[PDB]
Design a binder for this molecule. Structure first.
Ligand SMILES: [N]C1=NC(=O)[N-]2=C([N]1)N([C]1O[C]([C]OP([O])(=O)OP([O])(=O)OP([O])([O])=O)[C]([O])[C]1[O])[C]=[C]2
Ligand SMILES: [Zn+2]
Lengths: 265, 159, 862, 171
DNA sequence: TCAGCGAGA
RNA sequence: AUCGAGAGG
DNA sequence: TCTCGCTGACCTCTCGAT
């Protein structure tokens, strides 16, 4: 049926569209219970029921009960094959920078601007990341593209002409592709469906823990700490250090080891 | 040319030409020597559990004048021998019995003598024992810990 | 301390300054690397546990207390126990032992690894570390290394190699003073031997010890050059000083290339012990040392006269000089009987002594696996004919006579352990009783009243060994599939506090009563001598005996430390015999290997003029393509040895006076250009000579030390003494036609080994089964019953063929198309097969993973 | 020998007290047993012995039909006087190698090497009949276990050959 | 490890 | 499932 | 023009510990 594979940047509205539930605050399914924790990384409300065509309360038990939500259960009747499909998101307290665009071989985060990789890294490391988002939003593609085109037309050197035409090509790509700038800064972070990260049971009580689950849990821990320190006024230094920790956490989640030491459990 | 009763039953015809001046040593002598150095009593703190104890035995508070010491250590008889350790699926280990000592000095009076000395014997974990064949029995499975070839400590100059 | 010594020696001796001064002004060399054994690593782990305990003690005692601080509450044994348990069981160097044969255990225990914690990495390592170094001579075997990524990094200790106090490998050398070799031995490390010039072992010497040649080949400073007698400082102690234990077992090693010697040394370790251990006709003389030092053979601790002999146990009456004053004078050697191995093989000890036979210290009393009268016996001597036979030994293949299968020369016992574990569950859904729901009457009767199968019963696939039902679906332990065998042993484990069912009590008490009877008999055997001596403190002896019996009973009845959550564990041991079939890997000691392709009838095999057929037919084209001439030389020498044995057997068949046998055996032992061995039969008694001739009737064993083996002339002389052609080739006749083969064919006895690569363990075939969760793909193992990976290169092959539909069905219909798989199975079963491929689930997984990265990827309809 | 039943033995992979040889070795030694039966194919032999000393093929109870050609070779050994051995041996008649794997508790199946012929060698030499020198003589050399008569072996082989050839003789 | 690669200085 | 240690091709 | 990160380097089986 499909004829092409279209790839583009995802808007925060696009990420919220994918997600079925806006909750990721807890960490693990349970310490001793097979039932998924409510609003956790694994949850029946968000990602779907572990049980196949069943309700725990049992008010409606029939084939017609499919698609009907029990008041006590509050969970869909669908299978786990949709639990592989359902997605969630984490509402970040503060915007954060995507590690791919900031730390690529060409820094397209720095390529739209004029600052080098070191300057952007220093700005986003102090935290910070909202400053880069504001700089990207304040930039105008049309006016900057016209100025760069004029400068390339009145060019005296080959290297300067190459840099100007690279910048103009990037601006034209942003204009034509339909992806706005400042989307390199992520404010809504989607979470993978639960079945794609096994957390496989063992014969004993202990389960082998997938690395993605641990990384997500640590990122959510940092996000909750930032939410608390924003709800209650805190000194600027502590909040900045905590925001740096959150940025490092999301960077290790998206691509571990790109900048600094990788997270070791 | 056969003196042992086992070899006298059937003597192998030897075509070797070079006289043998040094007999082949014990094939597992390395494991036996290593674990014997590790286990056996060392009068000096050079090798083994003795040298291990002289490292972090003096654990105490900072300038508290009350330090924790010991006099010696002893390894007990294993509860089970190798065969029934393999049968039961349990580690073949010997309990470690260590006699520790504690000294109490006068508060803010370093010149004064030690107030009291308290010595007592304490059980400290299970140390697995190696059989006569140079192997270990861990959780009912017979195991071998091989030697490691690592760079000698010191200074070297390489490009 | 070794580090401080090395730091002082390197700088010829503020410490940081001296390094910079010499820097302004080869790591693989042995002097730069030292050996760390199990003792030092265990000490380091103890140090880690002890510093953790010290930190805990400091934290606890920072509060401070007057008379309330004691050694007990400060320390805790949990961290030390955890650290030592992790080291013994989870460390990289703590490895599951290779228990295929005594040689495998010896090699594993003498193994040296450059990897491990605080060491190199196989992928990061380069060619410099993996290559042989002039310091490897005598310390590390250059021949025996793994063939995979671990080449050069995993190494085996040499025969004569030691370690000094500082941990550096050293080798023995014969001190040379004033041009004459002196028997005194000095162990030299690499840096120490580099200064000196060392003569070679292959240096002729006179009676007084002087070098025969005016100029003697030597080495110095890592290079070998000719030297005069005066400059020589040291000499090699033996010709086996360089090779390891495994490599020294190869006869005629100097006639093979190092590649095939490596292959033979490795393949000697996968050899599976057979029903009867058969000594190697051609050997080196290291078999006895390997067998004794492996520990698989019972060795008399004290010399005495054998008092009791049995399959299960041996009793030695210690001599008067060897008894302790308090010792009764009885040594009991219980023998291992049909126990499982790490590699699922069998461990068996069979007595090699008779009642009343005198025994001295160090004598072998029982023969372990792959051992024959104290000699390592990894395989069977086989009569080999090097000739093509209708392409059944076409490409390195092997053709085997049916007489080999009939005589069970290569039949092996393999023991499989199966465990049934009952776990604690609320409401009691799981059952362990004999009565199970929906169980056949025959299957129920197969198990005992306790729910466990009887010892000695024959079990085939799909038969329950232990009865269990859980909710209640039958959770009974059963053999998985295909595997068949007999129940040789059953073990039931219960905790001290775990509730014991009466039927389970019956089984466990039967086992405990058998163990207690064995222990009581063993104790009474030793107590009988003391009681008889008392007849010539009876109450005290009786009290001591009763106390020992009570202690043994308590130890037997002591509950096992079961893991939490499980009540009882029942272990069932199954033993089956594997007979050779087409598909089984066979190999020798010279790097040659092959797979049996056909079991040929006895009459069809080529036969000699006397009518004796050959057992093995090997392609001669595999000999000159490779560089393993040692196999041909061993074949000729084995033919000569079997000829000598045949002459001895012929003189035994018709009654011959002992004088003739003594004369012939003395002539056979005296043969050789110049041999150090001097076997004198005049010393032996008539019964000793008769026993020796009985042992030699199947072939006289031959010892050929590596780099010192038998010359070709000696092999020809041995062939002459046995009335055999000196060329080693005889006229063979085709079994199917009776027509003589147009050319002479070399025929002899080569020591063949059966490797742990049986075809039944490797044959696998899957139709459909379990699929993975993250990707709906078939599993990836034979144990998991998974399909075969269709890698990218195979997709390239199908693309090159242009097989679009085959590739499409393998990508979708055979995997990742759940609806496609479900419809395809029905289509195939119904007989009208049509597929509708869809989107693989792995592509959807990829899309979800990419979307979770913040990138929007979608499926554009048009 | 096809089946062996020992009173105190449950399976092959075990040992019996007072016997130096394992049960598997005893089964191999019983496989290496040569007997002749004239009455019927199936016959049961019982072996009983007590006290120290090797157990040979003479120790099987005497049967008129069954003739043990070699009563000298040992089956097992008894080490102490108190021990005793009691086994029932089953002997059948057949041809070729029939493995035990191919088609109760305590009976031990044994691989049957039925064929009594160990080695065959034949040589052709010149023979002088009348004044003709073109004729030759065939000298067949046999090695057996003693179970079969060489002349009877020749007669049986020739009869088998003729029975096979009669198919080619007919159309 | 050990290369090779372009892009900042 | 993952990791470590091996082994075969 | 030259450092300076970033990139790259077939299939199968067995074992145990998490
Ligand atoms: N990708 C890949 N990486 C590897 O490391 N190895 C592979 N394949 N093989 C495969 O196996 C054939 C040689 O094995 P071998 O033992 O039969 O050696 P050989 O010379 O051909 O014959 P022989 O052993 O008798 O001397 C070779 O082509 C290949 O397909 C072996 C190692
Ligand atoms: Zn309901």
């Amino acid at each position: 049926e499909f004829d092409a594979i279209k790839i583009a940047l995802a808007s925060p509205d696009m990420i919220r569209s994918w997600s079925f539930g806006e909750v990721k605050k807890p960490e693990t399914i349970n310490y001793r219970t097979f039932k998924p924790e409510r609003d956790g990384l694994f949850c029946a409300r968000i990602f779907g029921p572990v049980k196949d065509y069943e309700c725990l309360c049992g008010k409606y038990k029939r084939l017609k009960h499919r698609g009907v939500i029990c008041e006590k259960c509050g969970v869909e009747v669908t299978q786990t094959k949709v639990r592989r499909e359902r997605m969630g998101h984490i509402e970040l307290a503060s915007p954060t920078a995507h590690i791919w665009f900031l730390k690529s071989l060409p820094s397209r985060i720095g390529l739209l601007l004029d600052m080098p990789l070191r300057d952007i890294e220093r700005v986003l490391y102090f935290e910070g990341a909202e400053a880069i988002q504001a700089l990207l939003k304040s930039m105008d593609l049309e006016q900057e593209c016209e100025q760069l085109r004029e400068e390339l037309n009145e060019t005296n050197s080959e290297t300067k002409r190459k840099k100007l035409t690279k910048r103009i090509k990037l601006l034209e790509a942003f204009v034509q592709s339909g992806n706005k700038p400042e989307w390199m800064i992520l404010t809504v972070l989607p979470v993978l469906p639960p079945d794609l990260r096994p957390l496989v049971p063992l014969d004993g009580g202990r389960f082998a823990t997938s690395d993605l689950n641990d990384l997500y849990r640590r990122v959510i821990n940092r996000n909750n700490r930032l939410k608390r320190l924003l709800d209650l006024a805190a000194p600027d230094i502590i909040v900045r250090n905590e925001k740096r920790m959150l940025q490092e956490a999301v960077d290790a989640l998206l691509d571990n080891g790109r900048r600094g030491r990788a997270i070791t459990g | 040319m056969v003196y042992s009763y086992t070899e006298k039953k059937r003597i192998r015809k030897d075509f070797g030409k070079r006289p043998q001046v040094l007999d082949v040593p014990y094939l597992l002598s390395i494991q036996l020597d290593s674990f014997q150095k590790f286990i056996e009593q060392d009068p000096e703190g050079q090798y083994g559990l003795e040298a291990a104890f002289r490292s972090v035995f003096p654990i105490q508070s900072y300038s508290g004048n009350s330090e924790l010491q010991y006099v010696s250590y002893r390894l007990g008889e294993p509860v089970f021998d190798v065969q029934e350790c393999q049968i039961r699926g349990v580690t073949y280990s010997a309990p470690l019995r260590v006699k520790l000592r504690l000294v109490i000095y006068e508060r803010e009076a370093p010149e004064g003598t030690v107030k009291d000395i308290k010595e007592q014997e304490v059980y400290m974990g299970e140390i697995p024992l190696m059989t006569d064949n140079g192997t270990f029995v861990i959780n009912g499975t017979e195991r071998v810990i091989v030697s490691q070839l690592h760079r000698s400590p010191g200074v070297f100059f390489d490009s | 301390a070794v580090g401080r010594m090395k730091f002082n020696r390197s700088l010829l001796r503020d410490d940081i300054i001296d390094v910079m001064k010499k820097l302004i002004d080869d790591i693989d060399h042995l002097g730069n690397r030292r050996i760390r054994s199990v003792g030092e690593m265990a000490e380091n782990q103890f140090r880690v546990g002890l510093v953790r305990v010290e930190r805990a003690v400091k934290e606890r005692l920072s509060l401070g207390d007057l008379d309330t601080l004691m050694p007990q509450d400060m320390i805790n044994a949990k961290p030390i126990s955890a650290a030592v348990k992790e080291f013994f069981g989870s460390s990289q160097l703590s490895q599951f032992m290779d228990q295929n044969n005594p040689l495998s255990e010896i090699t594993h225990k003498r193994r040296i690894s450059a990897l491990g914690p605080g060491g190199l990495t196989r992928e990061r390592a380069g060619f410099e570390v993996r290559d042989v170094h002039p310091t490897h001579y005598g310390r590390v075997c250059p021949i025996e290394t793994p063939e995979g990524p671990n080449i050069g990094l995993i190494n085996s200790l040499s025969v004569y190699a030691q370690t000094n106090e500082y941990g550096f490998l050293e080798t023995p050398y014969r001190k040379v003073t004033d041009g004459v070799v002196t028997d005194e031995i000095h162990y030299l490390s690499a840096i120490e031997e580099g200064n000196y010039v060392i003569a070679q072992a292959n240096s002729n010497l006179d009676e007084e010890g002087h070098f025969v040649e005016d100029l003697v080949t030597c080495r110095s400073k890592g290079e070998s050059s000719l030297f005069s007698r005066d400059q020589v400082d040291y000499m090699d102690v033996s010709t086996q000083q360089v090779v390891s234990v495994g490599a020294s077992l190869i006869p005629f090693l100097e006639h093979d290339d190092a590649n095939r010697a490596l292959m033979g040394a490795n393949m000697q370790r996968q050899a599976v012990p057979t029903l009867r251990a058969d000594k190697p006709l051609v050997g080196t003389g290291m078999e006895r040392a390997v067998a004794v030092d492996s520990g698989v053979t019972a060795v008399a601790k004290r010399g005495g006269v054998v008092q009791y002999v049995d399959a299960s146990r041996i009793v030695i009456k210690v001599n008067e000089d060897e008894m302790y004053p308090g010792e009764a004078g009885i040594d009991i050697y219980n023998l291992t009987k049909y126990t499982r191995s790490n590699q699922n093989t069998c461990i068996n000890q069979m007595p090699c002594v008779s009642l009343g036979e005198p025994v001295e210290r160090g004598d072998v009393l029982a023969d372990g696996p792959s051992t024959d009268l104290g000699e390592l016996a990894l395989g069977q001597n086989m009569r080999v004919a090097f000739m093509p036979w209708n392409g059944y030994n076409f490409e390195d293949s092997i053709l085997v006579s049916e007489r080999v299968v009939q005589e069970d020369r290569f039949t092996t016992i393999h023991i499989q352990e199966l465990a049934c574990v009952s776990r604690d569950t609320k409401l009691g859904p799981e059952e362990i009783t004999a009565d199970i729901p929906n169980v056949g009457e025959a299957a129920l009767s197969k198990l005992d009243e306790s729910g466990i199968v009887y010892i000695g019963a024959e079990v085939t696939g799909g038969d329950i060994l232990v009865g269990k039902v859980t909710p209640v679906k039958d959770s009974s332990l059963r053999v998985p599939n295909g595997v068949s065998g007999t129940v040789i042993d059953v073990q039931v484990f219960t905790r001290d506090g775990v509730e014991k069912d009466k039927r389970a009590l019956e089984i466990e008490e039967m086992q405990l009563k058998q163990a207690k009877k064995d222990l009581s008999e063993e104790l009474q055997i030793l107590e009988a001598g003391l009681f008889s001596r008392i007849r010539a403190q009876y109450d005290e002896l009786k009290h001591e005996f009763e106390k020992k019996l009570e202690a043994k009973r308590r130890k037997i009845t002591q509950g096992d430390d079961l893991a939490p959550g499980v009540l009882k564990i029942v272990k069932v041991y199954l033993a089956v015999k594997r007979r050779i079939q087409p598909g089984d890997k066979m190999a020798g000691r010279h790097g040659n290997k092959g797979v049996i392709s056909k079991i040929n009838p006895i009459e069809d095999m080529p036969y000699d003029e006397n009518g004796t057929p050959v057992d093995i037919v090997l392609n001669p084209l595999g000999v000159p393509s490779r560089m393993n001439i040692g196999q041909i030389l061993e074949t000729h020498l084995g033919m000569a040895a079997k000829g000598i044995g045949d002459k001895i057997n012929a003189m035994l068949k018709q009654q011959q006076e002992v004088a003739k046998l003594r004369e012939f055996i003395q002539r056979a032992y005296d043969l050789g250009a110049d041999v150090r061995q001097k076997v004198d039969l005049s010393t032996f008694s008539d019964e000793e000579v008769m026993r020796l001739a009985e042992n030699l009737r199947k072939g006289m064993p031959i010892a050929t030390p590596v780099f010192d083996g038998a010359k070709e002339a000696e092999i020809k002389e041995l062939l002459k003494l046995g009335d055999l052609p000196t060329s080693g080739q005889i006229r063979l006749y085709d079994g199917r036609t009776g027509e003589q083969f147009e050319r002479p064919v070399t025929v002899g006895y080569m020591y063949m080994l059966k490797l742990n690569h049986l075809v039944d363990d490797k044959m696998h075939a899957r139709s459909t089964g379990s699929y993975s969760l993250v990707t709906q793909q078939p599993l990836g193992g034979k144990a998991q019953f998974g399909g075969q990976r269709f890698g990218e290169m195979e997709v390239w092959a199908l693309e090159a063929y242009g097989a679009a539909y085959t590739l499409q069905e393998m990508l979708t219909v055979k995997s990742d198309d759940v609806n496609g798989r479900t419809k395809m199975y029905k289509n195939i079963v119904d007989g009208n097969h049509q597929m509708e491929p869809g989107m693989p689930e792995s592509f959807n997984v990829l899309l979800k993973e990419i979307r979770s990265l913040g990138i929007n990827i979608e499926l554009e309809d048009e | 020998v096809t089946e062996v039943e020992i009173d105190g033995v449950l399976h092959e992979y075990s040992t019996k007290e007072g016997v130096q040889e394992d049960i598997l070795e005893i089964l191999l030694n019983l496989k290496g047993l040569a007997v002749r039966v004239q009455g019927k194919d199936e016959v049961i032999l019982t072996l009983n012995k007590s006290g120290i000393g090797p157990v040979t093929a003479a120790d099987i109870t005497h049967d008129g039909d069954v003739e043990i050609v070699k009563p000298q070779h040992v089956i097992c050994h008894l080490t102490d006087e108190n021990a005793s051995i009691s086994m029932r041996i089953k002997v059948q008649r057949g041809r070729g190698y029939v493995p035990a794997s191919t088609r109760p508790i305590g009976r031990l199946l044994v691989d049957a090497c039925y064929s009594p012929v160990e080695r065959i060698a034949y040589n052709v030499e010149a023979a002088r009949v009348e004044q003709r020198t073109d004729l030759d003589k065939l000298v067949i050399e046999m090695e057996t276990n003693g179970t079969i008569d060489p002349e009877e072996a020749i007669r049986r082989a020739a009869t088998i050959l003729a029975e096979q050839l009669e198919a080619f003789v007919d159309l």
